Amino acid sequence: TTTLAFRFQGGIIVAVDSRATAGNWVASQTVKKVIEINPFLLGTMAGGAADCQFWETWLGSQCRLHELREKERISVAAASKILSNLVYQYKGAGLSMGTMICGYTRKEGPTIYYVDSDGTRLKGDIFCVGSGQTFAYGVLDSNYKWDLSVEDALYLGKRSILAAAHRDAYSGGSVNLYHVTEDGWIYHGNHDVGELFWKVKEEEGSFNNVIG
Amino acid sequence: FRNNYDGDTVTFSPTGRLFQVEYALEAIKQGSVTVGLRSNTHAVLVALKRNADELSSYQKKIIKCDEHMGLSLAGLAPDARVLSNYLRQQCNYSSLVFNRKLAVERAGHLLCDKAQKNTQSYGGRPYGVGLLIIGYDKSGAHLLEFQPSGNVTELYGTAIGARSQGAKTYLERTLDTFIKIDGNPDELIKAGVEAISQSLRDESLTVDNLSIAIVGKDTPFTIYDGEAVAKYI
Amino acid sequence: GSRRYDSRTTIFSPEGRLYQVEYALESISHAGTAIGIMASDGIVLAAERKVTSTLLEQDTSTEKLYKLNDKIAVAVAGLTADAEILINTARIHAQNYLKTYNEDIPVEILVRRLSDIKQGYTQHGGLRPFGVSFIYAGYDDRYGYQLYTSNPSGNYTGWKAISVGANTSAAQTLLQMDYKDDMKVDDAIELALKTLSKTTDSSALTYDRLEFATIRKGANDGEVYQKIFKPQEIKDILVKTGIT
Amino acid sequence: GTGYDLSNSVFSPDGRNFQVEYAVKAVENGTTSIGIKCNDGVVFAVEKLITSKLLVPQKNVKIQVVDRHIGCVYSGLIPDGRHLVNRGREEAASFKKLYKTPIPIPAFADRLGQYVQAHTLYNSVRPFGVSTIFGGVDKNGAHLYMLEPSGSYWGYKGAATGKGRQSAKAELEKLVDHHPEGLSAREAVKQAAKIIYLAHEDNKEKDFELEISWCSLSETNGLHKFVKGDLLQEAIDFAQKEIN
Amino acid sequence: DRGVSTFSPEGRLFQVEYSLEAIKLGSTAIGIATKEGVVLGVEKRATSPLLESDSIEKIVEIDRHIGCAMSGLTADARSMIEHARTAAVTHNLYYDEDINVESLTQSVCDLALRFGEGASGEERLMSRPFGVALLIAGHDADDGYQLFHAEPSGTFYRYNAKAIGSGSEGAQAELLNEWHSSLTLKEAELLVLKILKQVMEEKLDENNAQLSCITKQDGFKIYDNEKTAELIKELKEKEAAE
Amino acid sequence: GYDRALSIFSPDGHIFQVEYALEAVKRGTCAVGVKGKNCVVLGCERRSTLKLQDTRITPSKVSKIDSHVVLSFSGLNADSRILIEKARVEAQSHRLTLEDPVTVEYLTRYVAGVQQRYTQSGGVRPFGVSTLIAGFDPRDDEPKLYQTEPSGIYSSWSAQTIGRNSKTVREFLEKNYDRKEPPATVEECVKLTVRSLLEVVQTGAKNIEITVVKPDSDIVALSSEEINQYVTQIEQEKQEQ
Amino acid sequence: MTDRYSFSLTTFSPSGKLGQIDYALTAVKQGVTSLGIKATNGVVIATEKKSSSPLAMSETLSKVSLLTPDIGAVYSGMGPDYRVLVDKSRKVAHTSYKRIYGEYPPTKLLVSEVAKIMQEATQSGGVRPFGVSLLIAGHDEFNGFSLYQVDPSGSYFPWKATAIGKGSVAAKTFLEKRWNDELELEDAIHIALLTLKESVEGEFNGDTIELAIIGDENPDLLGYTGIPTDKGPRFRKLTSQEINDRLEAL
Amino acid sequence: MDIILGIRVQDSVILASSKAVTRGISVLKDSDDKTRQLSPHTLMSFAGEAGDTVQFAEYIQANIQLYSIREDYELSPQAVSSFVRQELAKSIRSRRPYQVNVLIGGYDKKKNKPELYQIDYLGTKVELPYGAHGYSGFYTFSLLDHHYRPDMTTEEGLDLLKLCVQELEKRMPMDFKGVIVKIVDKDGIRQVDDFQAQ
């Protein structure tokens, strides 16, 4: 798995792969690793499939309850702390999850929180999580500027996940892109690596090693 | 007198009575009439649904407990939900653990014991609802009458609720007839509708006012309401 | 069942009053008078021993003045047995505070806790309240010398001078008549004894019917000191103030 | 004063427990039931009033078995009776599990006894509204017992309770005097059917249904069983004949 | 005294009956169901002019397709709402679908009889019944628009139109006449506002009365004062029109 | 073990223990709160059944739940401590889980819930307390004022009073407070408050304590002098006529 | 079942009285007289053994009980309550003191524990107060000899001498006249026997009287030798014979 | 481990804490502030297990703030450190102990003196002129044992730290990404935003 989210001039970019494995067995290439908690909140998933997917769905429930109770949208900081505290109650039990809670609120602006089953909760501008994180960091880190155009940031992200899909045996399938602005997130498609790779190879001229 | 011995269910009156149980029994008499009768192949329930306004709905009187069992109520609706839900659990347990359909006679004993527990301990109140239970098990068709006192009885037919004495006399009169209505559900139901109408007064049974249920040989307990009961009015 | 014999010790009257609390106070009103007077350089506690005899061993007796801490003490008015229950928990509370923070417990903190306990028997549990009123005399570095009072309701307040028990009205009037913000411990000691003397239901105010205590910062040291006077010490001070 | 009959575990000035006595009223108001101890077993019989033609004949069985060798019949609040039998079954199961041997009738009796007596010790419970006749065959023969709402019980030669308890007792005493050598299980069954028919006069208004069960060393192998079919009809005829 | 779960000689539960009485003393509440949605209106009833009338919340959202109005000891409804919301959200979490309005109502009613000082049947810890009634309005794909009346008795009825509270007996009589199976949402709105106006001691304005509705398209919404003030004006005109 | 239902319905549909709880509030010293355009003020009266107390240590009537919210009350003093402690505890917890201090309406809803719960729980009596909670939500400048009572009901007010003679002081406020133009000044806001209390305090400079709350955790209680001054400038308003 | 009496059976009356405790006190007044006298070198506690049938063997019952080897108790009021109070008192001296410090508790503290037990029966749910007053006498290294009285309320006080029960008023007045801070134990014992004589109707001998003392250490009553620091119990019940001998010098 | 340093000079206590947050093979953040203010004149730094660290610091902050509100007073640094030691001492024998080490730097307004407390996850508390948790102590203790004086100024202290930080950046194995320095004195707590080149 490879997931990343970074903050920039045009808001936030969120990109994930879609591969699921059990040992060396590729269980699936069609997993939805991004959860649309709500029109303005996103959750990314890495680690144990059932763990992320179950607990983040639960998080969505807790978030909705908050709004019904307070007649107001839950903050990114508070949404991430609910998952953080839940997961901490289970410390030592073996939950496995590297997660990112990304959103927008008039009060906080573009925000990103990294939350893992270790109890670690961190706010940041850039985070890559999963067995493919380093591969994504390599591409993302060396082309990141706070001044990318929404269109360039979108590509950098997509390309970063592509990089991981290629080098990490445990990452792959397709890329799922999201852009987060104050009017919520905007889906930016599902890009199957089966065609995305060759397209990028030709157009960009990178991946010069692989012969085509 | 009575006022000194009816403050709870843990007190006997000087004559050996339990008033809290008796007051509970009253709630049933104030409830809408419901009839139950059976042949050797089917068991039927017919109930008069009461409504609040003409803007409100008619409260359901029949509850399914399992594919082969169900009942009709008279009295506190909530208590019926509690008791039927418990009957459902007992039916369920019999299947899951023994791969056995709960016999109607056993359901009756279980119900009796549950009701009883609420008439001998402090703090609890008796149930305020009567239940007629029909079902088809390994011994055929059955009809049970459940009273909040814990007394459960197997009969060929009966009726509870306001003006119930009417239908009861009629059934006690039709006995030799309806009990032989085997292999013809429609006839048994019509005998049931004739029995219930013997307890009418206020009005006449309409389509969104009548409720009928049947269970039998090759008939899973099924409820009929509205248009479904039209062919019987 | 049991409901038949339940007195319901925790309910409001149609006037919004707590019966048992009222009745408990009614009980306190017949208890030996206890007075607390706070001076600039110390505090004084004085109580009248209710019911006494020739045979009562006074040297070993204590029915109104109890040490809670090295800097806090209380005067009791009401059921002595009920007070001991509270007293002992107060002693534990002070040591818990010390163990936790490595600092002596601030006087108000001790008083609030004890008051909270009383309050509880007032809102839940169906048990009767403690028939006790306390006058707290203590010193800490945040508020210096302090004088508090708590009663069965669980409410507490601070005072410059105050009394609990019997003839409090008469006693309060006499105190509110001769108390002066710039009093000296010894002045307070005298005002205390004079008040008791005029409120006493007894013939004369003799030492054998009194318990005395002071919390003074013995200049020749720099630390505060608690002193629960002994029979002779009271007999002396009694002759001096002019009550022989 | 008065009011000694409003709460269960209360003693009246004359040492009585009225709530228990009131329970007895519910029992006397019930159907008549009996027990006859023969030379190698016991016979149980009861009156089943036919409130209406609507009751399916032979369907609402009153007599209950505990374990495999014990029979139970009672008069009064049926639901209370079932409740007591449920306790008996648990009681018998617990005994067998540990001691292996099915529970001896005498031990079973005291098990029911202590339980029923327990319901006269607190005001939070109500005494049992039934008198129960039970027994069976064990290592040392047959045993017949009757248990009252007070928890009282003794061994009997013959026993009756309910509406026609007097007719029955009269009849049972007759049998005792005319059979010092003992009655057989077969005879006890017929005689039981008669006693019930006779005692039915104190309720001759409603029609009834007879029910008999028996536990005999020679007739049922010590196991409790219902008397059905021909042996039953035969007993009914023997009664219907002597009723005229 | 007498057990909180005691039966009267007529077969009713004292506490429950007395509970209903407290409800009669409550602020008026009215609900009207139409094939276009359901309208829920309530009387604010401020006990003083200094009380900021918009802090009076007698109409609340259970879920996006379910809202409800309360009448009686309103503070008692807080735990009922929490329970209703939790049930609605939980059903979604476990079944990946919205909860049916009828079930949500049945769920709320199940708490009803959960009172007593030791009732043998489970663990009913609550010293007394609730002192508030509710009108639960919503929509679901199975039975469309629905209006329910839930009482502290544990029972609930479905109504085409229903009024609860102080002026209910009169308002219900009115509804018995005014209502018909073809009303439009707008028609139901004016009708609610009209009946409220009649029974309210105060001169109905956009500050002592509040309207809301639930439609399949936009879910449950509470009309803001500006929107309601205009509906009020629109009423006065049609009334004075004849 | 004790679980007797103490708060129950009577024939006419009333919960007498809750009602008698209000009677306890009626007997309590007066308390009032008025919200200006950029602040909120709380004033309480001091009894005089006994005077010789040490005002330094005697617990005050206005309590801080957090640094931006305060609570005052009327009724049983012992009972109020319990509500205040719980509220303070909840305030810290909310800061921990939501990573943001409580809003005045939230803190109010919590306190009110505690009171409601004590009206339908076995073995306990309702709180003989009505409160006034005021402050400024985090990063907000709009003043907040709420009131809660034994029943568990709460609501916001432009200005309100509870306690003895609260009937009187409310009248004063209803015909002396204009929502159109709320006391645009901290000073004129504190004046209206001291005026409303004088209607019932009957000359009590040492019997009147005021506390001012401004946006961003700015809370302070005036001293006898600052107050005595207001009293002074007001008795002249009368005489100068 | 299950004790549903979780509420207090002793509450305040409008007058401010706690009825149940007053009534308990009343029961104490009706009880047989018992008294205690402290000397300079000992303490003596005594009472009359009011046999309730000539067929009953009064020796099988003891109104004067040993709590610790240096502490004894006697009472007036309901004997069965006293009996269980003795069992609890002996146990608490262990569970709350000997098991902690490896030494028996000083007189005032054990009295304090007993007193607490009684106070609880005055406020806990479902119980009545104990219908007895106790007289506890003992000795401990840092406090010497002491004598205490414990009432049904849980209150206790130290005495030089006193009496409770039936003829306490008369007995107390008599003790006030004879007591002085110079009495030796034998003197106190003599005074005790004299005081008790007035309160006794019928027979007055070592078989109808029960008396014990807290005096010197009795190494002879230890049951073993070898440990210098263990010198023997200070508590000792006088024998019937020992009593009659003193009655001749009455 | 992370670097947690504390040094008490003449009239203040200075705490320095590494900014790196590394998980396995990746440094996730380089600006992490390993500190919680317990009260206006008391600051606590921490290091240890991934989740316990913050859960413990915040749990304590909540309690000290609660004490502050209730008593309308600020507990002395000595009192706070004692409360902290107690909590950790309970923890060590609990089901799942907090694996957290902390430095507590406060300014005692009553005594008018700065104080520094070192407390490990076992509940071991000691007051010192300077302290450290983790491996840092292996280089910084002898350093300060050499270059430290009681009467030093705050400015001197910051230079003393710069000296410690440099030694750590030279000899320590990991890249801790520099530190964040804070000063606690009579006027409260402030952060020296310019140490990345002071």
User: In total, how many domains does chain G have?
Assistant: 1
Residue A66 CA from chain centroid, whole number: 24
What are the counts of helices (DSSP H) followed by strands (DSSP E) for chain F?
6, 10
User: C-chain residues within 8 Å CB-CB of B8?
Assistant: 1
SS (H, E, C) H101-139: EEEEEEEECCCCEEEEEEECCCCCEEECCEEEEHHHHHH
Cα dihedral F78, F84, F90, F93, rounded to 10, equals -100
Sign of CA dihedral D16, D20, D25, D30: negative
With contact defined as beta carbons under 8 Å apart, do G33 and G171 qualify?
yes
Sign of CA dihedral F206, F209, F210, F216: positive
* Structure letter (DSSP) for residue F125: -
| H62/F91 CB distance under 8 A | no
D121 to chain C, any CB pair closer than 8 A? The answer is no
Structure solved using which method?
X-ray
Domain ranges of chain H: 1-198
User: A-chain residues within 8 Å CB-CB of H21?
Assistant: 120, 122
User: In total, how many domains does chain A have?
Assistant: 1
Place of tokens 């056993």: B106
Provide the b/e sequence for G25-55 (b: ≥16 CB within 10 Å). bebbeebbbbbbbbbebbbbbbbbbbeeeee
With contact defined as beta carbons under 8 Å apart, do E75 and E106 qualify?
no
C-alpha neighbours within 13 Å on the C-beta side of residue G101: 7
Nearest to B229 by CA among B21, B14, B28, B47: B47
* Structure letter (DSSP) for residue E116: B
Sign of CA dihedral F168, F174, F178, F184: positive
Q: Which residue type, as a one-letter code, is found at position H106?
A: G
Spell out the domains of chain B, with CATH numbers in brackets. Answer: 1-233 (3.60.20.10)
The SS3 call for residue C205 is coil
| C13/F56 CB distance under 8 A | no
Spell out the domains of chain C, with CATH numbers in brackets. Answer: 1-244 (3.60.20.10)
| A68/E63 CB distance under 8 A | yes
Spell out the domains of chain D, with CATH numbers in brackets. Answer: 1-244 (3.60.20.10)
∠ CA(A29), CA(A35), CA(A40), 5° rounding?
A: 145
Distances (CA, A) of E20 to E72, E165, F166: 9, 10, 31
C-alpha neighbours within 13 Å on the C-beta side of residue H62: 20
CA–CA separation, B104 and E6 (whole Å): 31
C-alpha neighbours within 13 Å on the C-beta side of residue B12: 29
How far off is chain B from D73, nearest CA to CA, in Å?
Answer: 16
**In what side-by-side order are the strands of the sheet with F129-135?**
F62-66, F69-75, F129-135, F144-148, F154-156
The pair of structure tokens assigned to B109 is 């004993």
Q: Which residue type, as a one-letter code, is found at position F38?
A: N
Interface mutation target, options C72, C109, C110, C123, chain F, most CBs of F under 10 Å: C123
C-alpha neighbours within 13 Å on the C-beta side of residue D11: 3
User: Which residues are CB-contacts of A137 (< 8 A; sequence separation ≥ 6)?
Assistant: A128, H26
Q: Which is catalytic among the residues A1, A2, A3, A105? A: A1
Beta bridge partners of C159: F53
Cα dihedral E70, E74, E76, E80, rounded to 10, equals 30
The SS3 call for residue G115 is helix
The pair of structure tokens assigned to B11 is 């007190």
The SS3 call for residue A168 is coil
CA–CA separation, H64 and H49 (whole Å): 22
User: G-chain residues within 8 Å CB-CB of F4?
Assistant: 7
- What F85-94 contacts at long range (C-beta under 8 Å, 24+ apart), as own/partner pairs, is F85/H70, F86/F110, F86/F111, F86/F114, F87/F111, F88/H66, F88/H69, F88/H70, F89/H66, F91/F65, F91/F66, F91/H69, F92/F66, F92/H62, F92/H63, F92/H65, F92/H66, F92/H69, F93/H62
User: In total, how many domains does chain E have?
Assistant: 1
The pair of structure tokens assigned to B136 is 């088809």
- E145 phi and psi, to 5 degrees? -70, 130
Nearest to C105 by CA among C74, C142, C135, C133: C142
Interface mutation target, options C3, C5, C6, C11, chain E, most CBs of E under 10 Å: C3
User: E-chain residues within 8 Å CB-CB of B13?
Assistant: none
CA–CA separation, F151 and H38 (whole Å): 37
With contact defined as beta carbons under 8 Å apart, do A179 and A154 qualify?
yes
C-alpha neighbours within 13 Å on the C-beta side of residue C211: 27
Sign of CA dihedral B182, B183, B189, B190: negative
CA–CA separation, F47 and F55 (whole Å): 12
User: F-chain residues within 8 Å CB-CB of H65?
Assistant: 92, 95
Nearest to B132 by CA among B25, B37, B21, B232: B37
User: Which residues are CB-contacts of D90 (< 8 A; sequence separation ≥ 6)?
Assistant: none
CA–CA separation, F154 and F73 (whole Å): 13
CA–CA separation, E137 and E162 (whole Å): 11
E17: containing domain: 1-242
Nearest to F59 by CA among F77, F43, F73: F77
End-to-end CA distance of chain F: 66
With contact defined as beta carbons under 8 Å apart, do E153 and E17 qualify?
no
Between helix E101-112 and helix E77-95 the angle, nearest 10°, is: 130
Out of 3.40.30.10, 3.40.50.300, 3.60.20.10, 3.40.50.1220, the CATH code matching F1-241 is 3.60.20.10
The SS3 call for residue D135 is strand
With contact defined as beta carbons under 8 Å apart, do F106 and F181 qualify?
no
User: Which residues are CB-contacts of A24 (< 8 A; sequence separation ≥ 6)?
Assistant: A169
With contact defined as beta carbons under 8 Å apart, do H17 and H131 qualify?
no
Query: H1-198, what's its fold?
Result: Glutamine Phosphoribosylpyrophosphate, subunit 1, domain 1 (3.60.20)
Beta bridge partners of H107: H114
Domain ranges of chain F: 1-241
CATH number at residue G194: 3.60.20.10
Q: Give the residue on B whose Cα is nearest the Cα of E169.
A: B53
The SS3 call for residue H23 is strand
With contact defined as beta carbons under 8 Å apart, do C55 and G159 qualify?
yes
Distances (CA, A) of A44 to A113, E204, F54: 10, 51, 61
E86 to chain A, any CB pair closer than 8 A? The answer is yes
C-alpha neighbours within 13 Å on the C-beta side of residue E240: 6
Place of tokens 């009273």: B147
User: H-chain residues within 8 Å CB-CB of A137?
Assistant: 26
Nearest to H192 by CA among H155, H141, H151, H167: H155
Complete DSSP assignment for A43-108: EEEEE-HHHHHHHHHHHHHHHHHHHHHHSSPPPHHHHHHHHHHHHHHTTTS---EEEEEEE--TTT
Helix (H) or strand (E) holding H46: strand H42-48
Place of tokens 């037919």: B157
- G46 phi and psi, to 5 degrees? -150, 165
List the catalytic residues of D: 31
With contact defined as beta carbons under 8 Å apart, do A115 and A84 qualify?
yes
A140: containing domain: 1-212
How far off is chain A from F97, nearest CA to CA, in Å?
Answer: 7
Between chain A and chain E, the number of residue pairs with CB atoms below 8 A apart is 17
Helix (H) or strand (E) holding H180: strand H179-185
CATH number at residue A205: 3.60.20.10
Cα dihedral A197, A199, A203, A209, rounded to 10, equals 40
| F91/H70 CB distance under 8 A | no
The SS3 call for residue C128 is coil
| H54/A133 CB distance under 8 A | no
CA–CA separation, D55 and D33 (whole Å): 20
Q: Does chain C touch chain A (at least 3 C-beta pairs within 8 Å)? A: no
Interface mutation target, options C99, C102, C107, chain H, most CBs of H under 10 Å: C102
The SS3 call for residue E79 is helix
